Design an enzyme around this catalytic site. Structure first.
Site, PDB file in Angstrom:
ATOM      1  N   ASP A 130       0.841  -1.183   0.000  1.00  0.00           N
ATOM      2  CA  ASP A 130       0.000   0.000   0.000  1.00  0.00           C
ATOM      3  C   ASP A 130       0.877   1.234   0.000  1.00  0.00           C
ATOM      4  OD1 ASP A 130      -2.253   1.711  -0.070  1.00  0.00           O
ATOM      5  OD2 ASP A 130      -2.718   1.376   2.108  1.00  0.00           O
ATOM      6  N   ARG A 134       0.108   8.926   0.808  1.00  0.00           N
ATOM      7  CA  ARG A 134      -0.625   9.042   2.051  1.00  0.00           C
ATOM      8  C   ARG A 134      -0.043   8.177   3.167  1.00  0.00           C
ATOM      9  NH1 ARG A 134      -3.686   5.934  -1.386  1.00  0.00           N
ATOM     10  NH2 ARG A 134      -3.984   3.800  -0.558  1.00  0.00           N
ATOM     11  N   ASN A 135       0.819   7.205   2.856  1.00  0.00           N
ATOM     12  CA  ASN A 135       1.441   6.375   3.886  1.00  0.00           C
ATOM     13  C   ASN A 135       2.884   6.803   4.166  1.00  0.00           C
ATOM     14  OD1 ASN A 135      -0.590   4.603   4.781  1.00  0.00           O
ATOM     15  ND2 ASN A 135      -0.388   3.413   2.881  1.00  0.00           N
ATOM     16  N   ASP A 148       2.851   2.503   7.473  1.00  0.00           N
ATOM     17  CA  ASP A 148       1.690   1.741   6.975  1.00  0.00           C
ATOM     18  C   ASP A 148       0.588   1.879   8.006  1.00  0.00           C
ATOM     19  OD1 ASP A 148      -0.200   0.365   5.613  1.00  0.00           O
ATOM     20  OD2 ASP A 148       0.778  -1.627   5.676  1.00  0.00           O
TER      21      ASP A 148
HETATM   22  C1  LIG Z   1       6.859   0.269   7.945  1.00  0.00           C
HETATM   23  C2  LIG Z   1       5.627  -0.254   8.632  1.00  0.00           C
HETATM   24  C3  LIG Z   1       5.239  -1.575   8.481  1.00  0.00           C
HETATM   25  C4  LIG Z   1       4.089  -2.048   9.081  1.00  0.00           C
HETATM   26  C5  LIG Z   1       3.314  -1.209   9.860  1.00  0.00           C
HETATM   27  C6  LIG Z   1       3.688   0.116  10.033  1.00  0.00           C
HETATM   28  N1  LIG Z   1       2.973   0.929  10.958  1.00  0.00           N
HETATM   29  C7  LIG Z   1       3.131   2.267  11.131  1.00  0.00           C
HETATM   30  O1  LIG Z   1       3.809   2.951  10.371  1.00  0.00           O
HETATM   31  C8  LIG Z   1       2.508   2.881  12.350  1.00  0.00           C
HETATM   32  C9  LIG Z   1       2.017   2.185  13.452  1.00  0.00           C
HETATM   33  C10 LIG Z   1       1.660   2.860  14.607  1.00  0.00           C
HETATM   34  C11 LIG Z   1       1.789   4.244  14.716  1.00  0.00           C
HETATM   35  C12 LIG Z   1       1.473   4.950  16.014  1.00  0.00           C
HETATM   36  C13 LIG Z   1       2.254   4.954  13.579  1.00  0.00           C
HETATM   37  N2  LIG Z   1       2.164   6.297  13.585  1.00  0.00           N
HETATM   38  C14 LIG Z   1       1.523   7.285  12.893  1.00  0.00           C
HETATM   39  N3  LIG Z   1       0.357   6.972  12.286  1.00  0.00           N
HETATM   40  C15 LIG Z   1      -0.453   7.990  11.915  1.00  0.00           C
HETATM   41  C16 LIG Z   1      -1.828   7.623  11.488  1.00  0.00           C
HETATM   42  C17 LIG Z   1      -2.267   6.303  11.545  1.00  0.00           C
HETATM   43  C18 LIG Z   1      -3.558   5.983  11.164  1.00  0.00           C
HETATM   44  C19 LIG Z   1      -4.388   7.004  10.731  1.00  0.00           C
HETATM   45  N4  LIG Z   1      -4.005   8.286  10.670  1.00  0.00           N
HETATM   46  C20 LIG Z   1      -2.749   8.571  11.040  1.00  0.00           C
HETATM   47  N5  LIG Z   1      -0.171   9.310  12.012  1.00  0.00           N
HETATM   48  C21 LIG Z   1       1.001   9.595  12.563  1.00  0.00           C
HETATM   49  C22 LIG Z   1       1.925   8.662  13.065  1.00  0.00           C
HETATM   50  C23 LIG Z   1       3.025   9.435  13.493  1.00  0.00           C
HETATM   51  N6  LIG Z   1       2.827  10.729  13.272  1.00  0.00           N
HETATM   52  N7  LIG Z   1       1.604  10.823  12.708  1.00  0.00           N
HETATM   53  C24 LIG Z   1       1.050  12.128  12.303  1.00  0.00           C
HETATM   54  C25 LIG Z   1       2.576   4.270  12.408  1.00  0.00           C
HETATM   55  C26 LIG Z   1       4.845   0.584   9.416  1.00  0.00           C
END
Ligand SMILES: Cc1cccc(NC(=O)c2ccc(C)c(Nc3nc(-c4cccnc4)nc4c3cnn4C)c2)c1
Length: 266
Positions: A130, A134-135, A148
Site C-alpha cells: 500500500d 498518504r502512507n 503503513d
Molecule cells: C513500515 C511499517 C510496516 C508495518 C506497519 C507500520 N505501521 C506504522 O507505520 C505505524 C504504526 C503505529 C503508529 C502509532 C504509527 N504512527 C503514525 N500513524 C499515523 C496515522 C495512523 C492511522 C491514521 N491516521 C494517522 N499518524 C502519525 C503517526 C506518526 N505521526 N503521525 C502524524 C505508524 C509501518
C-alpha cells in the site's frame, strides 16, 4: 521489543482510526511527542496477532526513512504501539498544502528518502502493498519515512491475481514519484478505477508533471512496465536518484509537458 509503562504515556487528541482502536497524538516521558495506536477491549485473536505482529516487525526496522518504533504496551490494556511523531504529517496532504513551495532538488530528495526506505524494506523481505504518498510521513527536516497505517497505486499483477511483491511496490513507488512531482495530484484525475485499469492495460501511462526533470520522468515510466521482471529494483532506483542529486545539473533538463489547454496571445 521495548516495553513502555502506561504511566509514561499521555494520550491527548485523536488523529485517526485503527483496526480495533483509535490513533492518538501524545507525549512519552523518559517529554517526547508520539503517535499512539491502541487495541481496544474486545479485540479478536486475529487482531491481537496482527497488532503485536506489526509491533514486532516495526521493532526490527532501524532505518532513517522508516518510521521508528518508540515502544509497545503489551502487558497492560489497552495495548499500544508508540512511534515517533512527525510534525508535518502525511506527505500527500503536506504537498497539496504547500503547492509550489519547494525546489526540484528538495522534491527529488524526498523521493531518494522514500526509495532508500523501500530498498531497506524489500531487502528485509517486507512487501508493503500500500505504498502511496498518504502512507509517507514527513518530519521537520523534510525527511520522509515509510509508514503503513488502492487500485490507482497498484501494479497490474497485484490487481489481477494478487501477486504482491517488492516489484509491485516499485510500480507504486513510480506513482509516488508522480505524486511528489505534481504536489499531490490525484493519479489519473477523475478516471474511475475501471477506466484506470483499462487505460493501463491499453498501454497508456500518466503524463509528465509540469517542471519535471527528464531523468525523473524516465525513471517513473520504467517503474510502470507491464512486465514485472523489467522494472528497476529499488537498489537501481536509489542509485539513480542519489547520482542525480549529487550531480544536480542533471535535474535541469526537463521533460516536455503536454499542454491540455492552449492560450493564444499576440
Ligand atoms: C513500515 C511499517 C510496516 C508495518 C506497519 C507500520 N505501521 C506504522 O507505520 C505505524 C504504526 C503505529 C503508529 C502509532 C504509527 N504512527 C503514525 N500513524 C499515523 C496515522 C495512523 C492511522 C491514521 N491516521 C494517522 N499518524 C502519525 C503517526 C506518526 N505521526 N503521525 C502524524 C505508524 C509501518
Amino acid at each position: 521489543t521495548t516495553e513502555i509503562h502506561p504511566s509514561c504515556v499521555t494520550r491527548q487528541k485523536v488523529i485517526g482510526a485503527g483496526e480495533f482502536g483509535e490513533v492518538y497524538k501524545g507525549m512519552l516521558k523518559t517529554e517526547v511527542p508520539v503517535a499512539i495506536k491502541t487495541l481496544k477491549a474486545g479485540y479478536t485473536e486475529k487482531q491481537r496477532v496482527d497488532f503485536l505482529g506489526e509491533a514486532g516487525i516495526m521493532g526490527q526496522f532501524s532505518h532513517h526513512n522508516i518510521i521508528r518504533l518508540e515502544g509497545v504496551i503489551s502487558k497492560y490494556k489497552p495495548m499500544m504501539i508508540i512511534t515517533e511523531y512527525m510534525e508535518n504529517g502525511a506527505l500527500d496532504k503536506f504537498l497539496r498544502e504547500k503547492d509550489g513551495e519547494f525546489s526540484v532538488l528538495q522534491l527529488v530528495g524526498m523521493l531518494r528518502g522514500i526509495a532508500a526506505g523501500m530498498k531497506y524494506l524489500a531487502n528485509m523481505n517486507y512487501v508493503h502493498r500500500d505504498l502511496a504518498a498518504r502512507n509517507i510521513l514527513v518530519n521537520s527536516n523534510l525527511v520522509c519515512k515509510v509508514s503503513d497505517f488502492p487500485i490507482r497505486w497498484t501494479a497490474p499483477e497485484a490487481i489481477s491475481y494478487r501477486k504482491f511483491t517488492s516489484a509491485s511496490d516499485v510500480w507504486s513507488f513510480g506513482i509516488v514519484m508522480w505524486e511528489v512531482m505534481t504536489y499531490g495530484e490525484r493519479p489519473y484525475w477523475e478516471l474511475s478505477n475501471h477506466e484506470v485499469m483499462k487505460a493501463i492495460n491499453d498501454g497508456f501511462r500518466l503524463p509528465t508533471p509540469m517542471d519535471c526533470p527528464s531523468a525523473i520522468y524516465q525513471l517513473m515510466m520504467q517503474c510502470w512496465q507491464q512486465e514485472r521482471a523489467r522494472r528497476p529494483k529499488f537498489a537501481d532506483i536509489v542509485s539513480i536518484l542519489d547520482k542525480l542529486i549529487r550531480a544536480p545539473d542533471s535535474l535541469k533538463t526537463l521533460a516536455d509537458f503536454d499542454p491540455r489547454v492552449s492560450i493564444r496571445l499576440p
